Design a protein around this motif. Structure first.
Motif, mmCIF file in Angstrom:
data_model
loop_
_atom_site.group_PDB
_atom_site.id
_atom_site.type_symbol
_atom_site.label_atom_id
_atom_site.label_comp_id
_atom_site.label_asym_id
_atom_site.label_seq_id
_atom_site.Cartn_x
_atom_site.Cartn_y
_atom_site.Cartn_z
ATOM 1 N N UNK A 1 4.857 -59.618 -34.637
ATOM 2 C CA UNK A 1 5.336 -59.847 -33.304
ATOM 3 C C UNK A 1 4.249 -60.118 -32.236
ATOM 4 N N UNK A 2 2.967 -59.892 -32.538
ATOM 5 C CA UNK A 2 1.873 -60.169 -31.632
ATOM 6 C C UNK A 2 1.505 -61.649 -31.646
ATOM 7 N N UNK A 3 1.320 -62.206 -32.867
ATOM 8 C CA UNK A 3 0.774 -63.555 -32.988
ATOM 9 C C UNK A 3 1.697 -64.504 -33.682
ATOM 10 N N UNK A 4 2.759 -64.001 -34.313
ATOM 11 C CA UNK A 4 3.614 -64.802 -35.208
ATOM 12 C C UNK A 4 3.331 -64.588 -36.661
ATOM 13 N N UNK A 5 2.163 -63.984 -36.981
ATOM 14 C CA UNK A 5 1.829 -63.697 -38.370
ATOM 15 C C UNK A 5 1.431 -62.259 -38.529
ATOM 16 N N UNK A 6 1.825 -61.638 -39.644
ATOM 17 C CA UNK A 6 1.467 -60.273 -39.916
ATOM 18 C C UNK A 6 -0.027 -59.960 -39.704
ATOM 19 N N UNK A 7 -0.267 -58.945 -38.898
ATOM 20 C CA UNK A 7 -1.600 -58.442 -38.611
ATOM 21 C C UNK A 7 -1.551 -56.926 -38.516
ATOM 22 N N UNK B 1 -3.739 -72.127 -41.897
ATOM 23 C CA UNK B 1 -2.300 -71.855 -41.877
ATOM 24 C C UNK B 1 -1.469 -73.138 -41.797
ATOM 25 N N UNK B 2 -0.192 -73.026 -42.149
ATOM 26 C CA UNK B 2 0.741 -74.109 -41.759
ATOM 27 C C UNK B 2 0.860 -74.202 -40.222
ATOM 28 N N UNK B 3 0.902 -75.415 -39.668
ATOM 29 C CA UNK B 3 1.089 -75.591 -38.236
ATOM 30 C C UNK B 3 2.531 -75.093 -37.816
ATOM 31 N N UNK B 4 2.685 -74.683 -36.569
ATOM 32 C CA UNK B 4 4.036 -74.301 -36.144
ATOM 33 C C UNK B 4 5.015 -75.450 -36.276
ATOM 34 N N UNK B 5 6.213 -75.153 -36.820
ATOM 35 C CA UNK B 5 7.196 -76.214 -37.128
ATOM 36 C C UNK B 5 7.852 -76.811 -35.918
ATOM 37 N N UNK B 6 8.138 -78.109 -36.020
ATOM 38 C CA UNK B 6 9.051 -78.768 -35.063
ATOM 39 C C UNK B 6 10.440 -78.269 -35.265
ATOM 40 N N UNK B 7 11.274 -78.578 -34.292
ATOM 41 C CA UNK B 7 12.691 -78.235 -34.426
ATOM 42 C C UNK B 7 12.975 -76.810 -33.976
ATOM 43 N N UNK C 1 5.809 -63.389 -13.476
ATOM 44 C CA UNK C 1 5.905 -64.284 -14.624
ATOM 45 C C UNK C 1 6.038 -65.755 -14.226
ATOM 46 N N UNK C 2 5.093 -66.569 -14.711
ATOM 47 C CA UNK C 2 4.943 -68.011 -14.420
ATOM 48 C C UNK C 2 5.189 -68.920 -15.607
ATOM 49 N N UNK C 3 5.207 -68.366 -16.829
ATOM 50 C CA UNK C 3 4.980 -69.150 -18.015
ATOM 51 C C UNK C 3 6.168 -69.996 -18.313
ATOM 52 N N UNK C 4 5.949 -71.286 -18.576
ATOM 53 C CA UNK C 4 7.021 -72.236 -18.865
ATOM 54 C C UNK C 4 7.081 -72.745 -20.246
ATOM 55 N N UNK C 5 6.018 -72.505 -21.020
ATOM 56 C CA UNK C 5 5.999 -72.952 -22.405
ATOM 57 C C UNK C 5 4.957 -72.161 -23.160
ATOM 58 N N UNK C 6 5.190 -72.053 -24.438
ATOM 59 C CA UNK C 6 4.232 -71.434 -25.341
ATOM 60 C C UNK C 6 3.233 -72.487 -25.751
ATOM 61 N N UNK C 7 2.000 -72.335 -25.335
ATOM 62 C CA UNK C 7 1.089 -73.380 -25.664
ATOM 63 C C UNK C 7 0.425 -73.056 -27.013
ATOM 64 N N UNK C 8 -0.159 -74.099 -27.585
ATOM 65 C CA UNK C 8 -0.805 -73.944 -28.890
ATOM 66 C C UNK C 8 -2.271 -73.610 -28.655
ATOM 67 N N UNK C 9 -2.687 -72.407 -29.029
ATOM 68 C CA UNK C 9 -4.095 -72.018 -28.781
ATOM 69 C C UNK C 9 -5.133 -72.813 -29.591
ATOM 70 N N UNK C 10 -4.759 -73.199 -30.796
ATOM 71 C CA UNK C 10 -5.647 -73.965 -31.639
ATOM 72 C C UNK C 10 -4.848 -74.600 -32.766
ATOM 73 N N UNK D 1 3.394 -68.714 -35.914
ATOM 74 C CA UNK D 1 1.989 -68.530 -35.578
ATOM 75 C C UNK D 1 1.279 -69.880 -35.251
ATOM 76 N N UNK D 2 0.422 -69.952 -34.213
ATOM 77 C CA UNK D 2 0.007 -68.863 -33.366
ATOM 78 C C UNK D 2 0.754 -68.843 -31.980
ATOM 79 N N UNK D 3 1.955 -69.410 -31.913
ATOM 80 C CA UNK D 3 2.667 -69.523 -30.620
ATOM 81 C C UNK D 3 2.878 -68.172 -29.900
ATOM 82 N N UNK D 4 3.298 -67.119 -30.618
ATOM 83 C CA UNK D 4 3.402 -65.820 -29.862
ATOM 84 C C UNK D 4 2.087 -65.263 -29.407
ATOM 85 N N UNK D 5 0.965 -65.663 -30.016
ATOM 86 C CA UNK D 5 -0.303 -65.163 -29.509
ATOM 87 C C UNK D 5 -0.598 -65.650 -28.095
#
Ligand SMILES: OCCOCCOCCOCCOCCOCCOCCOCCOCCOCCOCCOCCOCCO
Ligand SMILES: Cc1cc2nc3c(=O)[nH]c(=O)nc-3n(C[C@H](O)[C@H](O)[C@H](O)COP(=O)(O)O)c2cc1C
Length: 374
Positions: free
Chosen positions: A292-298, A81-87, A110-119, A321-325
């Motif tokens: 809406x689950x992962x950022x990409x249609x599934x 996939x394309x990597x998640x965009x900056x900006x 709820x603790x989460x402070x950032x969407x981390x990149x899973x891979x 994708x894959x930030x919402x995952x």
């Protein structure tokens, strides 16, 4: 075109034109080794492993021990996939606020402070000298497959110089033509019916034609015949294929093979939740396609939480994708732990999951049922 079945069987050293789809989080090494032992081609989902070359090697070696030899009649699968965009700080921050509220309504802290990149993506491997590319060239699996797009052509060519056959998912005729121009060895024609993530090259493309597997195969094969293309890649069909009838119908287009995911999910060698399995045994709901689950249609079986998540999320509001995952996985985990569980989980499956329970959990029995006429 002439049938590609025999060429496929001879090229891959297999008996049956059947590929068990790589399924991140659902297929296992045991399932893959068993399907290769049975005479098809097992697959290992390595989409998360592009910068973890030790894991690539370890997993393949554990597969070799399960098979009993190092023939490596296997499909190693990666995400390109394309990597998640900056900006995108605005969208991303709004998505965290969204999830803050979801946790609040669930009654989960709820603790989460950032969407981390899973891979990362394999598209970020630009250099043929990268250790992952050198490793795959050394390991010589029969097949390396890509989902979501293609890595750079220098990387493709380098893998091919080691005899590896390279496959890519395509979802329309233009994607097929891209694959042809890049000299891929195989294309996996993925129908709208397919379970799990859709492999279109443009994420969530609004103009996607949503072709059913039959329609996609007919379109591609008609292009090959009409335009007189002489050396097409292997044509593999995937999406909603659940029984020997479904298989034969597609094989009558003179394609190479079929790739099946959902039909394996009831096997006791797969890893799905008891609630996911219950849905196969007593199907009540339709499936739906959502980004809406992962950022990409599934495609997943529909539930109340997944319909809520889907309708509450205009495309323009969804992080790449894959930030919402990461938000989704953290919810499902946090839910499971603090003892709510599966109301918040995903139920990946294709639109013929409701015809896929065959009253057995045995990979061998499922495989026998599929291949009866081959
Ligand atoms: O050729 C098939 C038999 O292989 C036996 C030993 O061969 C060893 C040397 O082969 C090296 C190269 O082989 C490349 C071709 O391999 C084709 C796939 O062979 C995989 C191994 O098959 C072993 C026999 O499996 C029998 C069926 O078991 C089904 C249930 O498996 C239990 C799963 O756990
Ligand atoms: C649970 C699940 C997980 C999946 N994960 C991946 C994956 O990691 N990589 C991949 O290339 N395709 C994956 N897919 C898609 C399959 O490759 C294939 O297109 C799909 O299973 C075919 O449709 P079917 O499920 O109706 O057989 C997945 C599919 C499912 C159902």
């Amino acid at each position: 075109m002439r049938s590609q079945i025999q060429s496929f069987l001879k090229t891959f050293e297999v008996r049956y034109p059947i590929i068990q789809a790589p399924m991140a989080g659902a297929s296992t090494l045991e399932l893959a080794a068993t399907v290769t032992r049975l005479g098809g081609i097992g697959s290992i989902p390595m989409g998360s492993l592009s910068e973890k070359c030790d894991a690539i090697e370890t997993q393949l070696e554990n597969f070799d021990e399960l098979v009993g030899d190092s023939g490596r009649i296997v499909n190693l699968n990666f995400f390109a996939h394309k990597e998640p965009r900056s900006g995108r700080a605005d969208v991303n921050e709004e998505w965290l606020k969204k999830y803050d509220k979801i946790y609040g309504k669930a009654g989960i802290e709820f603790d989460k402070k950032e969407l981390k990149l899973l891979y990362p993506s394999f598209r970020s491997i630009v250099d043929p000298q990268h250790p992952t590319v050198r490793l795959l060239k050394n390991l010589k699996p029969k097949i390396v497959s890509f989902h979501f797009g293609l890595p750079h052509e220098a990387v493709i060519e380098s893998l091919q110089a080691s005899d590896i056959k390279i496959f890519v998912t395509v979802t329309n005729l233009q994607e097929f033509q891209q694959a042809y121009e890049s000299k891929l060895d195989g294309v996996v024609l993925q129908g709208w019916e397919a379970g799990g993530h859709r492999g279109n090259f443009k994420a969530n493309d609004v103009e996607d034609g949503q072709l059913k597997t039959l329609d996609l195969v007919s379109t591609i094969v008609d292009y090959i015949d009409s335009a007189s293309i002489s050396n097409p890649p292997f044509i593999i069909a995937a999406g909603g294929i659940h029984d020997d009838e479904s298989i034969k119908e597609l094989l009558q287009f003179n394609i190479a093979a079929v790739q099946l995911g959902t039909v394996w999910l009831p096997s006791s060698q797969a890893t799905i939740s008891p609630e996911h399995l219950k849905m196969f045994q007593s199907p009540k709901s339709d499936t739906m396609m959502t980004a809406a689950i992962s950022g990409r249609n599934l495609r997943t079986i529909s539930t109340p939480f997944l319909r809520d998540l889907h309708q509450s999320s205009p495309l323009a509001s969804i992080p790449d994708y894959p930030l919402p995952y990461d938000s989704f996985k953290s919810l499902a985990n946090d839910a499971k732990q603090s003892g709510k569980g599966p109301q918040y989980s995903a139920f990946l499956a294709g639109s013929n999951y409701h015809k896929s329970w065959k009253d057995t959990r045995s990979t061998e029995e499922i495989f026998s049922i599929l291949v009866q006429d081959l």
